[PDB]
């Protein structure tokens, strides 16, 4: 019952990993499609990306501490560890919004230079997944605060544990292919 939904969500993440690989294949084809505009070296500020990498890494271990507290009967420590990985995930989203807002204002949006289309569709699709997991984390936080660590709530923590750690796995492929290969 619990393991059936957890295994079923793992199959969904395998289909979600194939979804991201199409964006990676589209990015690799279109990376040289700069229509006289900026390239990767003219855009990517690597100290800014390094802070974003650590914020998703800090939220990855923070969800692990929430899962550890779920394996004991500490309801209060699950909520407090879930509150810290929400703040680290909201810091990751806010830096990506600040990165995208600076490009759109400076005329480097997705509608110019179709390398920029592939950049906004891969980083933006990952940020939509982190935003989707941030809404799910807030819904799960109010369910544990109302109902406790019930059997349905413990399965949802482990389903989001698969989802949240998967987004840090995808981001490892993102800053490697997009940012670090682009800024060489």
């Amino acid at each position: 019952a619990g393991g059936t939904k957890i295994f079923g969500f793992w199959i969904y993440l395998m289909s979600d990993c194939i979804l991201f690989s199409i964006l990676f294949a589209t990015y690799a084809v279109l990376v040289n499609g700069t229509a006289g505009g900026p390239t990767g070296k003219d855009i990517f500020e690597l100290p800014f990306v390094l802070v974003e990498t650590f914020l998703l890494l800090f939220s990855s271990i923070t969800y692990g501490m929430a899962a550890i507290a779920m394996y004991k009967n500490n309801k209060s420590q699950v909520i407090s560890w879930l509150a810290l990985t929400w703040l680290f995930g909201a810091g990751f989203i806010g830096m990506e919004i600040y990165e995208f807002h600076h490009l759109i204002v400076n005329g480097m949006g997705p509608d110019r230079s179709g390398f920029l289309s592939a950049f906004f569709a891969l980083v933006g699709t990952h940020g939509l997944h982190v935003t989707s997991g941030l809404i799910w984390m807030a819904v799960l936080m109010v369910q544990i605060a109302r109902r406790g660590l019930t059997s349905t709530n413990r399965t949802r923590i482990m389903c989001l544990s698969l989802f949240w750690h998967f987004l840090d796995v995808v981001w490892i492929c993102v800053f490697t292919v997009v940012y670090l290969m682009g800024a060489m």
């Binding site: 079923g8 194939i18 279109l30 700069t34 179709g114």
Partner: protein, 659 residues
């Protein structure tokens, strides 16, 4: 009201569209009037519409597929009528504005809303029964997956009346489907019909993958599974691994038309060849999604009506696993003429013919299943013999197309058009009609009419050959696809035979309606009492007809392949237990309909740029998802008094009929 809706979007001063609009509105209001005349609104709700039962959901998938088969055929009869008139020098009805949305709609409806729900509906009805399961792994997700397909058929049907459909072909190739060559709402109707239905079938593939792996009966290993379950397992793998490609590819087309991005454009660094690479990376596994459970349907039918065990089970299983892996490495054969080199074209040409090898293993294993049996010529057996003759012709044709040098003169020809109708009508449609006839007593409790079912076969067989063997000849003559006006008179008298064969297919659709009417009219006489109307071998026929809504009072203990056949041979086969236990079953949920109702509002508002309605439609789906998560009344227990009433009324029909 707002956005681009202006009442000039409704195609007035266009009589062909307005007659079919009034035929669906008045045909739909008469359907509404019959439910309120009989008082069945509280019966369709709480038993059918909110049903988490896989048998109810499996039937409704086929009902959608059969209804959309009528629309997808009635515009295919208009292309045959137009091409017969356009040749021999008449510019009759169907202008190119009218004609070009017809093959786009015919391609979309017949792939996504005819062949896909019929294949999924046969897997929904049968696969939990064949493995000893009581339901699917995620029963609310199965109900939600059905209603996302309904959102797809609503959006294509309102494009008939509210706006227009796409004029790009059924796969919507770039720049012609771009915003500077298709500025209208037709591609937007194509985008959101495929996106909202495509997320429904993705959840279907996950649901049946977990059900086959985790919800099996005790003692049934993987190589003791039924062959239809093996074929359904490999078909759901291709759903999980390829329908994400369709989700990204249509979403990248969405960003081009809505946000002005450059993915598949000509000007600002976009690459239009990337979409055609991506749309066929999904595109060929989609056609192996359609044909794989059809291979599982024909393996059960050929074993049942030969009264013989299925020949070469291990070879048939590993041929299915060989197909589900080789389906992902062949997709460049759809664009051999794009301009890739000799190394790329020969590599994908060679491996396209490699996948013909496990298909030939399956064909000859069915031939030796009937090699020394006692063949009973049922209607479903007639579709099986007619499949082997038909699929061998169009399958051989595709291997000829797999050679790039042969494909350089046959690409986008009527030879290509005749190829894939040969393996869909011959393969999928014959398989869907065979499995419909085979599992009709299990779904409803009575048998279909045998006389009108055979006449439906004889019109669908060589009536197809009159329809599409001229298109084989026309593909050699040089006639290309999607030709509408001023067709060459040399192509006349071969388009005239193909139009005559479409009339014979129309009589076979009419024979299906007569077969369904006569069987319902005489269901009290042709009643299936024991639950095994034929000599059945799999665990589906161990139940009553229809199954008792939990499918199994006690889950069966499987020891061998063809578990119900071994029970009948060992002599037990019908054993009343001394006691029964309570059965944990899921509850019917009104959500899923509500999530889909907000999604068709969201889809319609995205097409017509009604941005406030799109936010309300999108937030309605998310809030209904969130408020469903707080529900704790998801399951209940079936009492033993309910079970003993259903089991004792099955075991006295076993007593009356000899057993």
């Amino acid at each position: 009201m707002f956005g681009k809706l202006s009442l000039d979007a409704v195609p007035f001063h266009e009589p062909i569209v307005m007659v079919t609009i009034a035929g669906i509105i008045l045909g739909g209001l008469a359907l509404v009037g019959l439910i309120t005349y009989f008082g069945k609104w509280t019966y369709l709700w709480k038993e059918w519409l909110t049903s988490v039962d896989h048998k109810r959901l499996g039937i409704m998938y086929i009902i959608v597929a059969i209804v959309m088969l009528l629309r997808g055929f009635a515009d295919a009869i208009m292309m045959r009528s137009q091409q017969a008139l356009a040749s021999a020098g008449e510019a009759g009805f169907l202008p190119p504005h009218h004609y070009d949305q017809i093959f786009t709609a015919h391609g979309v409806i017949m792939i996504f809303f005819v062949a896909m729900p019929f294949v999924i509906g046969l897997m929904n009805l049968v696969v939990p029964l064949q493995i000893g399961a009581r339901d699917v792994a995620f029963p609310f997700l199965n109900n939600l997956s059905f209603w996302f397909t309904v959102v797809g058929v609503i959006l294509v049907n309102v494009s008939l009346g509210v706006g227009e459909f796409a004029q790009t072909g059924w796969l919507a190739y770039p720049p012609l489907s771009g915003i500077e060559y298709s500025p209208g709402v037709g591609v937007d109707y194509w985008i959101w019909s495929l996106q909202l239905s495509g997320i429904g079938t993705t959840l279907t593939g996950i649901n049946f993958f977990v059900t086959i792996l985790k919800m099996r009966a005790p003692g049934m290993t993987m190589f003791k599974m039924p062959v239809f379950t093996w074929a359904s397992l490999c078909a759901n793998v291709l759903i999980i691994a390829s329908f994400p490609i369709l989700t990204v590819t249509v979403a990248l087309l969405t960003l081009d038309r809505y946000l002005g991005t450059h993915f598949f454009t000509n000007d600002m660094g976009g690459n239009m060849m990337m979409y055609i690479n991506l749309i066929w990376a999904w595109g060929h596994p989609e056609v192996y999604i359609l044909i794989l459970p059809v291979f599982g349907v024909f393996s059960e039918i050929a074993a049942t009506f030969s009264r013989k065990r299925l020949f070469g089970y291990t070879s048939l299983v590993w041929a299915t696993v060989c197909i589900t892996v080789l389906s992902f490495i062949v997709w460049l054969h759809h664009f051999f003429t794009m301009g890739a080199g000799a190394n790329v074209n020969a590599f994908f040409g060679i491996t396209t013919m490699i996948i013909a090898i496990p298909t030939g293993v399956k064909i000859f294993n069915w031939l030796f299943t009937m090699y020394q049996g006692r063949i009973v010529f049922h209607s479903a057996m007639l579709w099986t013999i007619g499949f082997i003759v038909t699929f061998s012709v169009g399958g051989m044709t595709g291997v000829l197309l797999a050679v790039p040098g042969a494909d350089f003169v046959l690409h986008n020809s009527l030879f290509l058009i005749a190829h894939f109708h040969n393996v869909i009508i011959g393969g999928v449609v014959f398989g869907c009609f065979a499995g419909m006839t085979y599992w009709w007593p299990k779904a409803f409790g009575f048998k279909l009419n045998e006389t009108w079912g055979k006449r439906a076969f004889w019109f669908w067989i060589i009536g197809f050959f009159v329809a599409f063997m001229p298109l084989y000849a026309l593909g050699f003559m040089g006639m290309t696809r999607r030709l509408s006006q001023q067709i060459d008179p040399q192509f006349h008298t071969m388009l005239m035979i193909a139009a005559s064969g479409a009339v014979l297919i129309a009589l076979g659709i009419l024979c299906l309606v007569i077969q369904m009417y006569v069987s319902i009219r005489d269901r009290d006489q042709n009643r299936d009492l024991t639950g095994d109307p034929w000599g059945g071998r799999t665990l589906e026929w161990a139940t009553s007809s229809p199954p008792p809504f939990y499918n199994f009072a006690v889950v069966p203990h499987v020891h061998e392949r063809d578990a119900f056949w071994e029970m009948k041979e060992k002599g037990e086969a019908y054993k009343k237990p001394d006691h029964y236990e309570e059965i944990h079953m899921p509850k019917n949920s009104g959500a899923g309909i509500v999530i889909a109702a907000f999604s068709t509002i969201f889809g319609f508002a995205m097409i017509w740029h009604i941005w406030w309605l799109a936010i309300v439609g999108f937030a309605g789906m998310i809030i209904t998802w969130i408020v469903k998560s707080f529900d704790e009344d998801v399951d209940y227990y079936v009492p033993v008094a309910e079970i003993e009433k259903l089991e004792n009324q099955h075991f006295d029909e076993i007593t009356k009929a000899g057993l």
